[PDB]
Design a protein around this ligand. Structure first.
Ligand SMILES: C[C@@H]1CC[C@@]2(OC1)O[C@H]1[C@@H](O)[C@H]3[C@@H]4CC[C@H]5C[C@@H](O[C@@H]6O[C@H](CO)[C@H](O[C@@H]7O[C@H](CO)[C@@H](O)[C@H](O[C@@H]8OC[C@@H](O)[C@H](O)[C@H]8O)[C@H]7O[C@@H]7O[C@H](CO)[C@H](O)[C@H](O[C@@H]8O[C@H](CO)[C@@H](O)[C@H](O)[C@H]8O)[C@H]7O)[C@H](O)[C@H]6O)[C@H](O)C[C@]5(C)[C@H]4CC[C@]3(C)[C@H]1[C@@H]2C
Ligand SMILES: CCCCCCCC/C=C\CCCCCCCC(=O)O[C@@H](COC(=O)CCCCCCCCCCCCCCC)COP(=O)([O-])OCC[N+](C)(C)C
Ligand SMILES: CCCCCCCC/C=C\CCCCCCCC(=O)O[C@@H](COC(=O)CCCCCCCCCCCCCCC)COP(=O)([O-])OCC[N+](C)(C)C
Ligand SMILES: Nc1ncnc2c1ncn2[C@@H]1O[C@@H]2COP(=O)(O)O[C@H]2[C@H]1O
Ligand SMILES: Nc1ncnc2c1ncn2[C@@H]1O[C@@H]2COP(=O)(O)O[C@H]2[C@H]1O
Lengths: 906, 906
């Protein structure tokens, strides 16, 4: 009968976890005491003796084949795989060297110390016991208050690889000790070790790949994914166990890593459910095994008490701590030299990071029960129980004190300021809306004291060289926060990628940490491109290149390099847009001329270098650029569409059912975006004919233009037309970036594909008024003046296309004037562009040469012509924007030009 | 060895579920066929017969104690408890009558038909086998295309109660048949039946209450809830089974119902994880048992084939169908008479809803295996397998055809129009944002054909009496859609409750069903107030009123009646708001005078009745009104706060860590709102002294006013002041609603608590200009003119309070004038109120009697005084709003009044 024991264990674990969670000490100790308490009555009363003797006397096989695989698979499941594989090499090498040296040193000191009549096998398996560790508690504290990510991942990898090597070493030595009937020839031993090392992971990789391929063809379902995944994990464990009593754990760890790595073939609800399932199983097993070890140690170790071991436990603890410290200190400088070193803080927090856990105690139980009636088992269990109960509390409190005294988990002034500002805005909004609500009729009888008590929130965070140094430091912090606020902004609109975001912000902090320093480019230079071992191996293999695999290998190689290329182009675009924003916003923050001009100069210099390198890599491969541009466009369209549908739901136009259905349709489209192939096809120069906005809807005119245009090419830094020269014709820019300067104070700007050149000269039969110079090798289509007359003829009875053309020629001239206006002060190009789009162009014929000016219109600008005022009678040279005091405007008949104007009504 | 059997079971279930899901036929029979296939190859090969013999000949005990509890607990878990308890009485009586009459008729026809040498017990247990049914398939089809909720709930309840009664009857009679050694004295039998009926549900209720109480004290945790809930369910099942072979299933069903009923003590993620867990377990058991029955029937029934039973199966099917149809038809008129009847469509959809499922087949396996080597078990298994395989496919195809031909699942024109409009808005938004994006620099090289192909979405839904009748019908539909669009709006801003929302919209739907009809009031009359059995019993018990329970009983009674009171007041408020809004908006939809005036008259009439009854119930209990008002206020403040923090996240001002933290703080506050006690304390008339906006911050003046004001009371429909009479003084309205009419065309309006009366007369030393009449018994505070002079004295060096007073007296006069303005055409009171709040009042001293008028100001209005124009020199009687052509305004020195003006700048 076992029900009462398991139920009591669950209840005690729940109550302890609830009660004792406030203190930083892990709960696991106190329940251990409960087990000891039970031992006190276990001998005393026959009843509890009956129950605990029924349970505690279990076979070692059940523990060895059940409790360990669950624990290790849990330790391997909940882990950011990407952060792991970004530090895999250093974490694995350091972990395995550290574990082997720790094991051998503690074994030889055990030989030197106890004078126990032991072979080297006992010592080395003892060392394998103390080599293991528990990462759940330390990562729990770090997620509680440490506020660091990389530290948790590296300590997790440390613990995981340590546990794997420890368990294989222990199992093989247990076989070799307690089953002496087996031969130990070298060939079978090395063959066994090699197949343990290799075949397991390959078997796990194969089963993971095939089950992911199976899952890839199932959509909008929930049950089949869970059932298939659980069945696959069990079959993997069963095969890997029947072949080897070790290979199962490594195979299932590899399976867990691979399954976690995949994301797009498994919906998020499935993975959150699986995460919770495995976490619950691990928690239950951990609680049961801790209570079990508590009762067995308090009922066995009472007969082997003396001062000798009670004094030697302390020196054992000091020994393991000092050896771990010296080995990691010895490996610090080589990691620094290789370019993968850490700080003092990381080293010292890793130094006291080793927390012995359930794995070592499980090994203690299995060796104790398998050893039979002997003093060795009692000594083993007492030693490991004492060492774990000591090290848990001591190392927990020293981590707490160390985190306080070194204080890397301190708060920073900038984020405190940001939180204070956010709370200010929230409380202001609350005040405004409650003041609005107070005026309502029905909602006036409410007592507002309890209201303002309940609704209110709280902040959770609560000449000289010296002056020049501190002001440039605070300017450095201000440009840092301007950068990071910008980067968060473009990510939120949907202009950039999440991993690109984290890479770029971590570049931000690492630039921030250095004194009087900002973001460099050598780190970026290595960031966007790759000269490593992967490009060399891939180029040499594709140059030197059973038949069908090779195309698959080369295509997956091209995919794996294009991914890095895309990420690099993305981070370049994000960095450049961030620089231009911070430079354009910081121009009025401070008045110290030298600092502002020097920072603007270095920002401009870096801008030039990054745009130069970006142009170089763009010329290397345009297809990746067009692919990422399309991906960006679809991302942002989907984002804005989902915002619009949420808004439409907000006005109540839809029941929740159809909103839910359309949300799923949008989510399906986004999921298809994730699996969009990174194809790199350059677009032909003929699709753009249909993509012109003001040539849209005219197939006949498009064909005529294709039959009446000349392809023109220009080299780097060439000039097409110059200011004041005769109108050579009309052009459409279709490749490259171009610069333009003219009379507006000479204005200068840069335009790109999607513009017409020489429109004013063709419309007015007038020479050039500005100079256009191409910045690189470009191509355009040129249209002659006779072809322009033919186009005017082919306008026929639809000059609304010509009306849109006149709208564009008004767009050319109005936006600089609207920018130089007080009513649109501080207005972005998007704001003004979305403003005048709703406006309409007007002629003088529909007004019969006389217009009345009302207050309905918001803005009005006339381009050219002969217009007079009816009341003021003042000759004003158009374009000219004045106040709305003028009410009537008179017009005359002119033949040299056609007078028109534009109105925007709000 | 059974591993290959279970693994193949899972694989076949997954592939059959995935492949065959498109067709309306349930997947199950497909795998059934596979089981049959296995049978015919089971005899072929020793290996397969070895495996199938190993697994198939399990004990009856394992199936009876494992498979059934899981299946019934799943059937009882996934269910809306509220919709169940709103139809509990009818569903339970109908289910139990139907099952008992079905069982007895099947038994007697079995005696008349087969001529099998059977006692009556075999006949009735055999009949009880097909009394059960499966609801998962039919609810699956209904959620697929039926688009009905109540039908699924009622058929689920029918199936659940049918299964419970069937299983208890079967258990007791299999015990009585196959164990004849037991005595059948009447006393023990009736005692056993009564205790099975009662003690089980009470045991489940007790354990559910105690475990919910235990869970109520644990916050921000995930593991302990899951572990405690699962442990509680297991202990309940174990105790219920050890006490009685039947009571376990009923006890755990009650436990599942109660646990599902509670929501606020368990976070949503725990609830969804538990649902997925139990669903997966049920699916696994169902698949295994179906393929198991398939193989056993195809390997046993091959030896008992003849034309006889093969002919009698059809008439057995016809018999069960006709008896179910006739009994439900017989119960239709009595349910109609009692007031709980259903339509023809509901009756016929219930008629063909009976789908035999896994429960009957499990009973078949247990009776077959327990019967041993006999012809009876083969006959039972063949009969039930044939009847289920027939009924599933036949009733599925006929239910599909019936849904098609009767077409209650048809689409309606209004929602088709709504979806069309929504699709139009989404597509136009996409076009606008892509046209905006086309202008950007970097995002110009993308080929937009693939872009517009990928981003595009599609609609998923793709004189005479006759003319008078159709136009009034279309007006009826238009007012219906206006109402429902309103109610969705008030719910979405957070002004109403979800269950109140669904209640109101189902009233709207059932009113819409009737021809030339709209929403009545008698249905509302029973909706808000309750005259049922509960108020009578609660009144009699509290009047007639081991010691400590009675206060708990009376308090929970008061809570359970105040809940209904709150819901009624809520639905009244929602309906009055909705009818007012639709009456406001429909005034310009149509031009036919008689229909519009008649509908507006009946709407106003119903408005008068509902406001009268609402005032009556408010006078009955004011405390519930103040409680619900406070709850409404906190709800809407929290809603707007979450909106603005999402907005702040949108501008990138916050990392999503702190956004997540603040979201949890808001969620904690909202959860505390859920558990807010419905206390009903009326507010004292003294807190409002501190709650005056323009008396805020002046404790000394508040104390002075409390020492210099008179409490005044008025009866129903009384008059305080009249237009043209002398200024009696100054008042502050602090109780009730009041009406006011004056000269603006006489304006009339209604004001409430939070206003001052006679301000203009006190400021100007002038008599009344409008008449104020109270609509009910009201109370105010009155201030004399000498006290007004004392208040002016106590203004001291802070007349900014008097400036706010002048802002209020400008609020009085400006809003009717701003309403009568073209620039604010179509503007709501919220819009204008949020408009002029940012404005500022101005005097003539700071301008030195001369003001220059710029374009920065958006609006300007002068109240009174002697102002002249510098340029126009036109005498304009203030207040008067004109165009901004005036640039300079001159002022003089006046002693009889103080001239001031107000400006709003945009
Ligand atoms: C959900 C979370 C996870 C953890 C947990 O909950 C929370 O999960 C719960 C759940 O999973 C529990 C388990 C469920 C299954 C249980 C099985 C049970 O053993 C079985 O108990 C049965 C009881 O009917 C039978 O025993 C027979 O009992 C008859 C009287 O009822 C006797 O007569 C007869 O003798 C017995 O049976 C006979 O006698 C022997 C057995 O007693 C031989 O086996 C023989 O063959 C057999 O004919 C059967 O025979 C025997 O095997 C065992 O005792 C405890 C058990 C394992 C449970 C332990 C506690 C749990 C893990 C619970 C735990 C808290
Ligand atoms: C990946 C995780 C795999 C976990 C499950 C894997 C492998 C399961 C193999 C069990 C180990 C063998 C037990 C030995 C023993 O003494 O058993 C005794 C009976 O004991 C049982 O029959 C226990 C089986 C119940 C455990 C099932 C747990 C499922 C979760 C016989 O003596
Ligand atoms: C909801 C409650 C479900 C679990 C409740 C109660 C469980 C009681 C089941 C007893 C049924 C008879 C078993 C039997 O014949 O014993 C055989 C052993 O067989 C076992 O011991 C099988 C144990 C399987 C337990 C798996 C639980 C999965 C959840 C030996 O004979
Ligand atoms: N404000 C402006 N914005 C954009 N393009 C312009 C502007 N002013 C002049 N241009 C272009 O510069 C060209 C100079 O010669 P054209 O007059 O032939 O046609 C002119 C336009 O194409
Ligand atoms: N437009 C208005 N809005 C609100 N209250 C008003 C308005 N016009 C007049 N009153 C009130 O009606 C009162 C009539 O007499 P009094 O002039 O003493 O003070 C006046 C104000 O309190």
């Amino acid at each position: 009968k076992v029900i009462v024991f398991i139920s009591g264990s669950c209840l005690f674990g729940a109550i302890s976890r609830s009660l004792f969670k406030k203190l930083p000490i892990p709960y696991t100790v106190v329940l251990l005491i409960l087990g000891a308490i039970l031992g006190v009555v276990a001998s005393n009363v026959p009843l509890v003796e009956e129950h605990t003797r029924d349970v505690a006397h279990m076979d070692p096989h059940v523990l060895l084949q059940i409790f360990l695989p669950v624990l290790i698979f849990e330790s391997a499941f909940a882990m950011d795989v990407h952060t792991f594989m970004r530090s895999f090499s250093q974490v694995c090498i350091l972990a395995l060297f550290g574990l082997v040296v720790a094991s051998v040193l503690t074994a030889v000191l055990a030989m030197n110390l106890f004078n126990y009549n032991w072979n080297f096998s006992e010592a080395m398996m003892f060392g394998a016991i103390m080599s293991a560790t528990d990462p759940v508690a330390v990562v729990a504290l770090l997620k509680d208050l440490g506020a660091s990510k990389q530290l948790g991942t590296i300590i997790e990898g440390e613990s995981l690889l340590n546990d794997g090597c420890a368990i294989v070493i222990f199992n093989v030595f247990m076989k070799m000790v307690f089953f002496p009937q087996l031969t130990s020839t070298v060939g079978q031993n090395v063959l066994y070790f090699l197949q343990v090392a290799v075949a397991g992971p390959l078997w796990g990789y194969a089963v993971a790949k095939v089950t992911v391929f199976f899952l890839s063809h199932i959509f909008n379902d929930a049950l089949v994914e869970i059932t298939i995944t659980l069945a696959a994990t069990y079959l993997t464990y069963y095969i890997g166990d029947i072949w080897l009593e070790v290979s199962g754990v490594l195979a299932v760890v590899v399976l867990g890593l691979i399954v976690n790595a995949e994301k797009t073939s498994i919906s998020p609800e499935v993975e959150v459910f699986l995460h919770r399932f495995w976490e619950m199983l691990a928690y239950l097993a951990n609680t049961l095994i801790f209570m079990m070890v508590g009762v067995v140690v308090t009922q066995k170790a009472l007969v082997a008490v003396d001062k000798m071991d009670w004094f030697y436990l302390i020196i054992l603890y000091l020994a393991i701590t000092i050896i771990r410290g010296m080995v990691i200190s010895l490996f610090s400088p080589i990691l620094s030299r290789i370019g993968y070193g850490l700080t003092w803080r990381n080293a010292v927090i890793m130094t006291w990071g080793g927390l012995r856990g359930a794995v070592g105690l499980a090994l203690a139980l299995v060796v104790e029960n398998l050893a039979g009636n002997d003093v060795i088992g009692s000594k083993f269990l007492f030693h490991t129980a004492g060492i774990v109960v000591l090290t848990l509390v001591i190392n927990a409190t020293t981590i707490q004190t160390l985190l306080r005294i070194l204080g890397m988990s301190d708060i920073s002034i900038p984020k405190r300021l940001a939180m204070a500002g956010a709370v200010r805005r929230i409380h202001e909004g609350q005040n405004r809306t409650l003041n609005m609500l107070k005026s309502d009729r029905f909602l006036a009888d409410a007592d507002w004291d309890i209201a303002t008590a309940a609704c209110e929130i709280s902040d959770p965070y609560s000449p000289s060289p010296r002056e020049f140094a501190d002001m440039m430091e605070e300017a450095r912090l201000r440009m840092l926060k301007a950068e990071k606020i910008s980067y968060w902004k473009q990510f939120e609109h949907g202009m950039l990628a999440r991993e690109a975001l984290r890479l770029l912000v971590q570049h931000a902090e690492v630039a921030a940490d250095e004194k009087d320093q900002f973001i460099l480019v050598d780190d970026l230079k290595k960031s966007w491109q790759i000269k490593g071992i992967y490009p060399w191996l891939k180029r040499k293999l594709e140059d030197l290149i059973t038949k069908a695999l090779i195309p698959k290998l080369i295509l997956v190689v091209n995919g794996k390099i294009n991914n890095q290329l895309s990420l690099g182009y993305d981070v370049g675009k994000g960095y450049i847009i961030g620089e231009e924003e911070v430079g354009k916003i910081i121009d009025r923050m401070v008045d110290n001329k030298k600092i502002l001009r020097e920072l603007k100069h270095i920002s401009e210099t870096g801008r030039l270098q990054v745009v130069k390198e970006l142009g170089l890599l763009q010329r290397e491969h345009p297809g990746i650029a067009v692919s990422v541009k399309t991906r960006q466009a679809i991302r942002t369209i989907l984002n804005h569409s989902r915002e619009t549908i949420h808004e439409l739901q907000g006005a109540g136009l839809l029941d929740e059912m159809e909103a839910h259905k359309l949300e799923l349709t949008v989510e399906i489209k986004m999921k298809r975006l994730m699996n969009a192939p990174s194809s790199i096809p350059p677009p032909p120069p003929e699709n753009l004919l249909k993509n012109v906005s003001w040539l849209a809807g005219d197939m006949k005119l498009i064909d005529f233009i294709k039959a009446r245009a000349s392809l023109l090419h220009f080299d780097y830094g060439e000039v097409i037309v110059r200011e004041g020269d005769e109108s050579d014709g009309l052009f459409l820019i279709v490749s490259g970036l171009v610069k333009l300067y003219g009379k507006s104070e000479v204005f200068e700007d840069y335009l790109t594909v999607g513009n017409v050149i020489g429109e004013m000269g063709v419309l007015t039969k007038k020479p050039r008024n500005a100079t256009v110079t191409c910045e690189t090798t470009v191509q355009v289509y040129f249209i002659t003046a006779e072809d322009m007359n033919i186009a005017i003829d082919t306008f026929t009875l639809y000059p609304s296309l010509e009306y849109r053309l006149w709208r564009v020629v008004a767009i050319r001239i109005a936006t600089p004037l609207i920018m130089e206006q007080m009513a649109f002060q501080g207005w972005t190009q998007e704001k003004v562009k979305l403003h005048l789009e709703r406006g309409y162009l007007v002629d003088l014929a529909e007004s019969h040469f006389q217009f009345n000016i009302d207050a309905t219109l918001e803005d009005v600008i006339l381009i050219n012509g002969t217009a007079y005022n009816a009341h003021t009678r003042e000759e004003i040279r158009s374009p000219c924007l004045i106040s709305r005091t003028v009410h009537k405007l008179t017009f005359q008949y002119t033949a040299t030009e056609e007078p028109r104007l534009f109105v925007v009504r709000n």
